[PDB]
């Protein structure tokens, strides 16, 4: 059985994340279609339609009914290793799975590193502006 950290590898767990997802029957981006594409629903107040790939951690919003999650995925994160996996999860080898998860662990560090840097740049921008205002 998979611990909380590895649950997102399960399509049915990803599907279950979609609660109050607006795009249902008739739509191309159904919860099932999003999940098959690797997305999980991670809504906020500011963005209630925010979805994120569990593997490469790319976050996308502004979803529209005819959006194809797979295509939006290839488009906005072409290098994602999950996209390369062409077989079902359960036909994966344990070695293969453990490799994929090493990639995923790296993806998360990289993502956490990018955020810390973005935050760092933001803070520096405030300091510079405050210095300029006092330089006047």
């Amino acid at each position: 059985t998979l611990p909380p950290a590895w649950q997102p590898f399960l399509k049915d767990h990803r599907i279950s994340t979609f609660k109050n997802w607006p795009f249902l029957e008739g739509c191309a981006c159904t919860p099932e279609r999003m999940a098959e594409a690797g997305f999980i629903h991670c809504p906020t107040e500011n963005e209630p339609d925010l979805a994120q790939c569990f593997f490469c951690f790319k976050e996308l919003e502004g979803w529209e009914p005819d959006d194809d999650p797979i295509e939006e995925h290839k488009k906005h994160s072409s290098g994602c290793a999950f996209l390369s996996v062409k077989k079902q999860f359960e036909e994966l080898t344990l070695g293969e799975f453990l490799k994929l998860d090493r990639e995923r662990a790296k993806n998360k560090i990289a993502k956490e590193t990018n955020n810390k840097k973005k935050e760092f740049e933001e803070t520096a921008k405030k300091v510079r502006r405050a210095i300029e205002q006092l330089a006047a």
């Binding site: 996308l60 919003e61 502004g62």
Partner: peptide
């Protein structure tokens, strides 16, 4: 859609 597009990037946050």
């Amino acid at each position: 859609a597009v990037p946050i």
